[PDB]
Motif scaffolding. Structure first.
Motif, short mmCIF file in Angstrom:
data_model
loop_
_atom_site.label_atom_id
_atom_site.label_comp_id
_atom_site.label_asym_id
_atom_site.label_seq_id
_atom_site.Cartn_x
_atom_site.Cartn_y
_atom_site.Cartn_z
N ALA A 1 0.86 -1.22 0.00
CA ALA A 1 0.00 0.00 0.00
C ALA A 1 0.88 1.24 0.00
CB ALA A 1 -0.89 -0.01 1.24
N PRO A 2 0.30 2.40 -0.22
CA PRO A 2 1.05 3.69 -0.25
C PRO A 2 1.78 3.96 1.07
CG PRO A 2 -1.17 3.99 -1.11
CD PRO A 2 -1.13 2.60 -0.49
N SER A 7 5.91 5.45 3.95
CA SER A 7 6.17 5.52 2.51
C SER A 7 7.20 6.60 2.23
CB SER A 7 6.72 4.16 2.03
N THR A 8 6.92 7.81 2.72
CA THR A 8 7.80 8.97 2.52
C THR A 8 9.28 8.62 2.68
CG2 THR A 8 6.13 10.10 1.06
N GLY A 12 10.20 3.44 -3.46
CA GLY A 12 10.94 2.58 -4.37
C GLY A 12 11.17 1.19 -3.77
N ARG A 13 10.65 0.95 -2.57
CA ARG A 13 10.81 -0.34 -1.93
C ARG A 13 9.48 -0.87 -1.40
NH1 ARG A 13 15.43 -2.62 -3.64
NH2 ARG A 13 17.14 -1.16 -3.52
#
Length: 16
Positions: A1-2, A7-8, A12-13
């Motif tokens: 998921a985002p 995420s920030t 890319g992983r």
């Protein structure tokens, strides 16, 4: 998921 929260820093992983 985002990334959203992690995420920030994991782009890319674990997130876009």
């Amino acid at each position: 998921a985002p990334s959203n929260v992690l995420s920030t820093l994991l782009h890319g992983r674990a997130c876009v």
